[PDB]
Enzyme design. Sequence first.
Site, PDB file in Angstrom:
ATOM      1  N   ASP A   6       0.918  -1.064   0.093  1.00  0.00           N
ATOM      2  CA  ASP A   6      -0.045  -0.120  -0.132  1.00  0.00           C
ATOM      3  C   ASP A   6       0.820   1.062   0.049  1.00  0.00           C
ATOM      4  O   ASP A   6       1.738   1.444   0.948  1.00  0.00           O
ATOM      5  CB  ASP A   6      -0.885  -0.111   1.354  1.00  0.00           C
ATOM      6  CG  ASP A   6      -1.496   1.168   1.645  1.00  0.00           C
ATOM      7  OD1 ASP A   6      -1.806   1.993   0.826  1.00  0.00           O
ATOM      8  OD2 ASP A   6      -2.095   1.361   2.791  1.00  0.00           O
ATOM      9  N   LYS A  67       2.552  11.595  -3.160  1.00  0.00           N
ATOM     10  CA  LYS A  67       1.205  10.965  -3.972  1.00  0.00           C
ATOM     11  C   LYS A  67       0.425  12.184  -4.452  1.00  0.00           C
ATOM     12  O   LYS A  67      -0.228  11.738  -5.523  1.00  0.00           O
ATOM     13  CB  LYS A  67       0.644   9.931  -2.899  1.00  0.00           C
ATOM     14  CG  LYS A  67      -0.114   8.872  -3.495  1.00  0.00           C
ATOM     15  CD  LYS A  67      -1.056   8.142  -2.606  1.00  0.00           C
ATOM     16  CE  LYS A  67      -1.634   6.986  -3.085  1.00  0.00           C
ATOM     17  NZ  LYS A  67      -2.524   6.362  -2.135  1.00  0.00           N
ATOM     18  N   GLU A 171      -7.031   0.850  -4.479  1.00  0.00           N
ATOM     19  CA  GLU A 171      -7.012   0.757  -3.133  1.00  0.00           C
ATOM     20  C   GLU A 171      -8.380  -0.075  -2.392  1.00  0.00           C
ATOM     21  O   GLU A 171      -8.199  -0.805  -1.754  1.00  0.00           O
ATOM     22  CB  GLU A 171      -6.578   2.009  -2.319  1.00  0.00           C
ATOM     23  CG  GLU A 171      -5.280   2.203  -2.756  1.00  0.00           C
ATOM     24  CD  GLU A 171      -4.931   3.725  -2.466  1.00  0.00           C
ATOM     25  OE1 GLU A 171      -5.648   4.528  -1.761  1.00  0.00           O
ATOM     26  OE2 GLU A 171      -3.667   3.879  -2.778  1.00  0.00           O
ATOM     27  N   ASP A 195     -12.801   5.229   3.255  1.00  0.00           N
ATOM     28  CA  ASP A 195     -11.564   5.320   3.662  1.00  0.00           C
ATOM     29  C   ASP A 195     -11.297   6.814   4.353  1.00  0.00           C
ATOM     30  O   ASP A 195     -11.207   7.797   3.601  1.00  0.00           O
ATOM     31  CB  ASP A 195     -10.667   5.324   2.296  1.00  0.00           C
ATOM     32  CG  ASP A 195      -9.311   5.122   2.558  1.00  0.00           C
ATOM     33  OD1 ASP A 195      -8.783   5.736   3.561  1.00  0.00           O
ATOM     34  OD2 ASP A 195      -8.525   4.454   1.637  1.00  0.00           O
TER      35      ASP A 195
END
Length: 377
Positions: A6, A67, A171, A195
């Site tokens: 991840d 990211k 994800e 999330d």
Amino acid sequence: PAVGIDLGTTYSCVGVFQHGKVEIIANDQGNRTTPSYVAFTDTERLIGDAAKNQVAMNPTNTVFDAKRLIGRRFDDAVVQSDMKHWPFMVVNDAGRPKVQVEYKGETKSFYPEEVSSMVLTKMKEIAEAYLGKTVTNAVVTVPAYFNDSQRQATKDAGTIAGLNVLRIINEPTAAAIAYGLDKKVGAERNVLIFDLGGGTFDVSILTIEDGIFEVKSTAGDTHLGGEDFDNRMVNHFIAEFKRKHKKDISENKRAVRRLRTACERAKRTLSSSTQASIEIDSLYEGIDFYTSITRARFEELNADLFRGTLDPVEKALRDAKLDKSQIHDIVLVGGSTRIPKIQKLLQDFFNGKELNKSINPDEAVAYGAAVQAAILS
Ligand SMILES: N#Cc1ccc(COC[C@H]2O[C@@H](n3c(NCc4ccc(Cl)c(Cl)c4)nc4c(N)ncnc43)[C@H](O)[C@@H]2O)cc1
């Protein structure tokens, strides 16, 4: 041996499927997550906790949130907006952004996949240290909404690390596979993945039929998370200080820090018991800050933000043309979903419906990537 990584915005995590059970490999420091931080200092380069820990001493050459820049152009609304808040330099090299640092007295410049290749190199190492073998093949996950460019920039970021990326995986599909939602039989099921991390919030609706997945819609709040919650507490306590002791501590960076830190920790405590105590000696001008907070009071400081999370839920149901009664499964990931009133809002919103939550929420993405890296192995 093949791993699931991840690759996150604030933390990364790495797992391996071994002996019929997944193992969330711990780092050289004993932590099952590793901050996605990379620092440059006079003499050496630092990745992970080493870099997170000298961010005060070198905030200007310590890079993070890569990211948020990966696969984007320099003029992307998001590269632009985020740039205002990063101690380090983002530089337009011909429309593609670069982070430029001081590293051994020489100023060097770095593409974001270069900087993510470093987090990936470190994660590779973390595993290779654990397994006592060479690790090459991996699955690396990305958010559902990442485009081609951002998938390619991640995939490369790994190929540069020495990885053989077996596959790039979304994800919320990583988390679905973690819960074995893809081994249910017969009719098509719709899955909502909630999330809620520390800084970002993402909803994703996927359809699953016979273990074949599809992404129906994307939502979220790109600046919401646990950190907004700690701030609510900091304000409650700074007001409470001003009350009892008629002092304003908020212009003392260190008092506020001691308080923030005690607030995030107290927050974690309130997910498992119904109040939480704080003693901070000599916090401001010699005065002791002894105080305590119930769960119910914490919930109230955040009541609007907890509800506000249901809007990306609605907005994502909108864009997926689905009624909330058609959602077959709810999956919780990201360490903030550990907050009970958040689980209570979601359960009650989805009319009493159960929640998939037994896998560690910080780890579940990495769990499913590693489960899946095993099959593609
Ligand atoms: N070690 C370690 C470590 C592992 C994962 C994370 C990531 O957490 C992201 C967000 O998730 C929040 N959070 C977390 N994060 C997981 C975590 C577990 C242990 C530690 Cl020491 C830390 Cl500090 C964080 N747990 C929470 C909880 N039980 N109740 C409410 N919020 C929780 C956390 O405050 C942060 O805002 C942070 C640290």
